[PDB]
């Protein structure tokens, strides 16, 4: 949870959102059956031309407050040990301790 | 245990013979919650008994139990150097359950084709009193009487 880690992952989603669209039609052309290899290879090399740090699958989300990789819940934006703090103080709306 | 708080649970659901002992035996032969498989096994065994000979299966089953339930049992107690095996008269409720358990246990290792046939064979043998279960019963009796000096 260093400063460098958060900064570089932030740069990662910035770079991913930079193009965020050329990937779509490149992969569409690759995956299109009625596309022919003549232009499909060109789309392949165009896809591989972009910087490697641009795919969505390289994004590992972290806690919005601590930048912690493990223990994440996507309903909220926080980690395992800050969601409890937020909820037990009553900050998180709708969340209560449950028995059922 | 110490509390003596749990009373008995009564379920009496014989589907086609109207006997409580048959339902309890179906409980004994059951494994992993297969009620219906146990019913099929018991009914097949009784049908094999009915087909083999003119004897009706229910009376054969009942008098096979009456020829297998033990009369006295051995219970161990230590004294600091030796454990003596005192005899106690089995309660009228324990004997039925012990007989059923022994019957099904030695049926499971009879060795012939199917469980229904194994039960059939065990019932035929016990109605005359010559199986392994009656050997176990008489072994228990002779052990218990051999330790009659303790009895109290």
């Amino acid at each position: 949870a260093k400063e460098s880690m958060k900064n570089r992952e932030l740069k990662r989603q910035l770079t991913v959102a930079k193009y965020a669209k050329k990937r779509a039609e490149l992969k569409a052309i690759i995956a299109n059956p009625n596309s022919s290899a003549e232009e499909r290879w060109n789309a392949q090399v165009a896809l591989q031309k972009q910087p490697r740090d641009a795919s969505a699958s390289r994004l590992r989300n972290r806690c919005r407050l601590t930048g912690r990789p493990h223990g994440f819940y996507r309903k909220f934006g926080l980690s395992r040990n800050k969601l409890r703090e937020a909820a037990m103080r009553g900050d998180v709306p709708g969340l209560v301790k449950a028995s059922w | 245990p110490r509390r003596r708080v749990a009373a008995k649970r009564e379920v009496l659901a014989d589907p086609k013979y109207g006997s409580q002992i048959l339902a309890k035996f179906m409980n004994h032969v059951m494994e992993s919650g297969k009620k219906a498989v146990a019913e099929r096994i018991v009914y097949g065994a009784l049908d094999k008994v009915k087909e083999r000979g003119k004897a009706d299966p229910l009376e054969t089953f009942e008098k096979a139990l009456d020829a297998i339930a033990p009369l006295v049992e051995v219970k161990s107690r230590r004294v600091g150097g030796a454990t003596y095996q005192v005899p106690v008269e089995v309660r009228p409720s324990r004997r039925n359950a012990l007989a059923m358990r022994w019957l099904v246990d030695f049926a499971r290792k009879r060795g012939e084709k199917s469980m229904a046939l194994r039960l059939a064979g065990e019932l035929l043998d016990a109605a005359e009193g010559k199986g392994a279960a009656v050997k176990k019963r008489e072994d228990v009796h002779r052990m218990a009487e051999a330790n009659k000096a303790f009895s109290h």
């Binding site: 223990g71 819940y73 040990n81 909820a87 709306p93 709708g94 209560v96 059922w100 | -």
Partner: protein, 99 residues
């Protein structure tokens, strides 16, 4: 014929909002069909409570989502649109259809 849907995280204020919208609905003189209690969503989480290794040390939380459905007949005076600011205030989400 209009359709009114209400959502909330708790039943106090959504019940209050339903009662006040329906009484305003009678006020204009329009027919109303009663409040329909829809099934309430219940979403649960289990979270470890120790900063380090204790797997059985867990705490369990849940969120409940309550829904209500109303409809009316023969409307003429629509101040509900004109009271939309007052009609929903804090934690009640209101949907209108076929206005």
């Amino acid at each position: 014929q209009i359709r009114i849907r209400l959502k909330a995280f708790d039943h106090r204020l959504i019940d209050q909002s339903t009662q006040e919208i329906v009484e305003t609905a009678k006020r204009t003189g329009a027919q109303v069909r009663g409040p329909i209690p829809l099934p309430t969503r219940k979403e649960r989480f289990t979270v470890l409570i120790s900063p380090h290794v204790n797997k059985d040390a867990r705490d369990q939380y849940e969120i409940r989502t309550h829904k209500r459905v109303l409809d009316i007949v023969q409307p003429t005076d629509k101040t509900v649109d004109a009271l939309m600011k007052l009609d929903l205030a804090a934690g009640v989400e209101v949907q209108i259809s076929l206005g």
